[PDB]
Design a protein around this nucleic acid. Structure first.
Ligand SMILES: [Zn+2]
Ligand SMILES: [Zn+2]
Ligand SMILES: [Zn+2]
Ligand SMILES: [Zn+2]
Ligand SMILES: [Zn+2]
Ligand SMILES: [Zn+2]
Ligand SMILES: [Zn+2]
Lengths: 84, 57, 56
DNA sequence: CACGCGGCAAC
DNA sequence: GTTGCCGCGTG
DNA sequence: ACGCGGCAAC
DNA sequence: GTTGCCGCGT
């Protein structure tokens, strides 16, 4: 019954969402194993891994220099650096 | 353009305020009912903040 | 542990296998179109396993 | 420089 | 699917 | 029959 | 953030 508030709900479904939005300081989050990103839901971590840290069979060049990358996350951080 | 006149969210770009006002604060002809109570709204932002307030409070 | 006669799913209980056969492997007179191409399926399992292969 | 498009990414 | 963020393309 | 639990695409 | 998903314990 939301041990934090002790506020009551009819179903456990909406109680979990009350905790995720209001009591986000008490939910065990998930640290990505490849970068400094922390993510609340584990399903969102799966997408983050699939999209950011998947080995690209091909290679995508930096839009500025002649460097090639086989991962999305490394490519984006590299192109961000070209501003310093 | 930094602050929005109809709500509290802050925006950096000028064009991003256009899409914000046009999506959140535009007037809809046909009203939309709240999924929980009997309220009806004509503004997207008013519906979202109300509908969130039910199961989030 | 019981094996479905139409897919590699394994179910523990007979009652759950019936529900699986009903919901997954049943026939649908009006076919459902794939969410990503023009393919049409009369069985839920075939549609699902096909649609998942669009991540390739 | 303004403006609008479209992709981005955790929620 | 949301929404602001941003890179970049037209003027 | 009923409801959760981890998961996933939008 | 929403909502449907399904095998499984109740
Ligand atoms: Zn609470
Ligand atoms: Zn990561
Ligand atoms: Zn570079
Ligand atoms: Zn506003
Ligand atoms: Zn309402
Ligand atoms: Zn089966
Ligand atoms: Zn298809």
């Amino acid at each position: 019954e939301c041990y934090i508030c002790h506020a009551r709900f009819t179903q456990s479904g909406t109680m979990k969402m009350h905790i995720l939005q209001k009591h986000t300081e008490n939910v065990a989050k998930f640290h990505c194993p490849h970068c400094d990103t922390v993510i609340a839901r584990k399903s969102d971590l799966g997408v983050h891994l699939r999209k950011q840290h998947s080995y690209i069979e091909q290679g995508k060049k930096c839009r500025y220099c002649d460097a090639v990358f086989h991962e999305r996350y490394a490519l984006i951080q590299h192109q961000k650096s070209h501003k310093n | 353009k930094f602050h929005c006149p109809h709500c509290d969210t802050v925006i950096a770009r000028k064009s991003d305020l256009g899409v914000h006002l046009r999506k959140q604060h535009s007037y809809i002809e046909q009203g939309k009912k709240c999924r929980y109570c009997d309220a009806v709204f004509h503004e997207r932002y008013a519906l979202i903040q109300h509908q969130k307030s039910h199961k989030n409070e």
